[PDB]
Design an enzyme around this catalytic site. Structure first.
Site, short mmCIF file in Angstrom:
data_model
loop_
_atom_site.label_atom_id
_atom_site.label_comp_id
_atom_site.label_asym_id
_atom_site.label_seq_id
_atom_site.Cartn_x
_atom_site.Cartn_y
_atom_site.Cartn_z
N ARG A 128 48.31 39.18 50.80
CA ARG A 128 47.65 40.48 50.68
C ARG A 128 46.21 40.30 50.18
O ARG A 128 45.97 39.49 49.32
CB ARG A 128 48.39 41.35 49.66
CG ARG A 128 49.85 41.55 49.97
CD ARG A 128 50.00 42.71 50.92
NE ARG A 128 49.83 44.00 50.24
CZ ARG A 128 48.69 44.67 50.17
NH1 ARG A 128 47.57 44.19 50.74
NH2 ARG A 128 48.66 45.83 49.52
N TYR A 155 41.75 37.66 38.83
CA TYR A 155 42.67 37.85 37.70
C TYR A 155 42.83 36.57 36.88
O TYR A 155 42.42 36.53 35.72
CB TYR A 155 44.03 38.34 38.23
CG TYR A 155 43.94 39.62 39.04
CD1 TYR A 155 43.69 39.59 40.41
CD2 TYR A 155 44.08 40.87 38.42
CE1 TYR A 155 43.59 40.76 41.17
CE2 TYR A 155 43.98 42.07 39.17
CZ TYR A 155 43.73 42.00 40.54
OH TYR A 155 43.63 43.17 41.28
N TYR A 156 40.48 42.92 33.05
CA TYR A 156 39.54 43.93 33.53
C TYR A 156 38.29 44.02 32.64
O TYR A 156 38.24 43.47 31.53
CB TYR A 156 40.25 45.29 33.68
CG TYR A 156 41.40 45.24 34.68
CD1 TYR A 156 42.69 44.92 34.27
CD2 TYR A 156 41.18 45.50 36.04
CE1 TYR A 156 43.74 44.86 35.20
CE2 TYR A 156 42.23 45.45 36.98
CZ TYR A 156 43.50 45.12 36.56
OH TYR A 156 44.55 45.05 37.46
N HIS A 175 48.77 38.52 45.73
CA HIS A 175 47.38 38.08 45.78
C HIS A 175 47.17 36.62 45.42
O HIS A 175 48.05 35.95 44.84
CB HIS A 175 46.50 38.97 44.89
CG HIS A 175 46.78 40.43 45.05
ND1 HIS A 175 47.35 41.20 44.06
CD2 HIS A 175 46.59 41.26 46.11
CE1 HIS A 175 47.49 42.45 44.50
NE2 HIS A 175 47.03 42.51 45.74
#
Ligand SMILES: CC(=O)N[C@@H]1[C@@H](O)[C@@H](F)[C@@](OP(=O)(O)OC[C@H]2O[C@@H](n3ccc(N)nc3=O)[C@H](O)[C@@H]2O)(C(=O)O)O[C@H]1[C@H](O)[C@H](O)CO
Length: 245
Positions: A128, A155, A156, A175
């Site tokens: 994705r 990977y 805020y 991801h």
């Protein structure tokens, strides 16, 4: 015109404003409004929300606008016309429930090779892309040629652990970096557009060339008493929307 596309990663707070293009539109996504400062100003060309929380983000966006915290010309739902990725009724009735909004797929699908590239790797290998990359595709589809990337860190830039968002998406406790980079390279290569990275401390700068140092100034405006959680519709609102949820 040029475009700055912002994910909401730590890098968003570490923009080298010296490298800001002359004149640009701004794309934001998801919980951009959690930012404690206007890292890219109050004016959005477009804001992008995932189908799964679209109802609640649209409701929250209306309050952001009403309250003069942000402006935006476009409102995009980042859909893909895939049954395993989003509710088919929501998509079918979208323009009647959200008449000033757009289905992102209306633009995403104009990039045939990328649509094909994405669909194959998602359905086959469960690769994705993140919204940062989705926004890129949509940007290219709108005819933007230079894209400046920020807030993308695999990977805020803010405390996301807010009550309402936690309630709606409990995963705020798929991801990969490579999948995103490969998609960006594919887009660059196939559509003949330019990627730039505005955040030199970002792991992104290993992969995309740094936007060029101009001697740009930018005023980072402070925020106070601002909306920093997503707002929840009434249960009667959900009642009416329920066929689509
Ligand atoms: C729990 C959950 O569902 N997390 C997803 C997350 O896996 C990712 F899919 C995404 O990204 P989201 O976290 O909002 O962050 C916005 C975009 O900023 C970049 N970014 C941000 C923080 C970080 N540390 N590294 C980054 O790269 C990515 O490009 C990301 O897509 C998304 O749709 O792309 O959306 C969220 C939620 O669905 C959404 O926030 C609900 O409204």
């Amino acid at each position: 015109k040029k475009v700055i596309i912002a994910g909401n990663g730590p890098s968003l707070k570490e923009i080298d404003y010296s490298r800001l293009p002359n004149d640009f539109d701004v794309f934001r996504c998801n919980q951009f409004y959690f930012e404690d400062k206007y890292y890219l100003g109050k004016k959005c060309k477009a804001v992008f929300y995932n189908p799964s929380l679209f109802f609640e983000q649209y409701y929250t966006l209306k309050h952001l606008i009403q309250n003069q915290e942000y402006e935006t010309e476009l409102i995009m739902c980042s859909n893909y016309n895939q049954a395993h990725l989003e509710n088919e009724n929501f998509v079918k009735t979208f323009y009647d429930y959200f008449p000033d909004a757009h289905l992102g797929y209306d633009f995403f699908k104009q990039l045939k090779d990328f649509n094909a590239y994405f669909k194959f790797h998602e359905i086959q290998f469960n690769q994705r892309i993140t919204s940062g990359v989705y926004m890129c595709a949509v940007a290219i589809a709108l005819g933007y040629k230079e894209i400046y990337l920020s807030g993308i860190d695999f990977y805020y830039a803010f405390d996301t652990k807010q009550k309402n968002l936690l309630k709606l998406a409990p995963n705020f406790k798929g991801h990969s970096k490579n999948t995103d980079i490969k998609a960006l390279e594919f887009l660059e290569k196939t559509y003949k557009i330019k990627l730039y990275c505005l955040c030199p401390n970002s792991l992104l700068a290993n992969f995309i060339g740094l936007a060029p140092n101009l001697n740009s100034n930018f005023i980072i405006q402070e925020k106070n008493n601002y909306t920093k959680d997503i707002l929840i519709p009434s249960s009667e609102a959900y009642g009416k929307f329920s066929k689509n949820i």
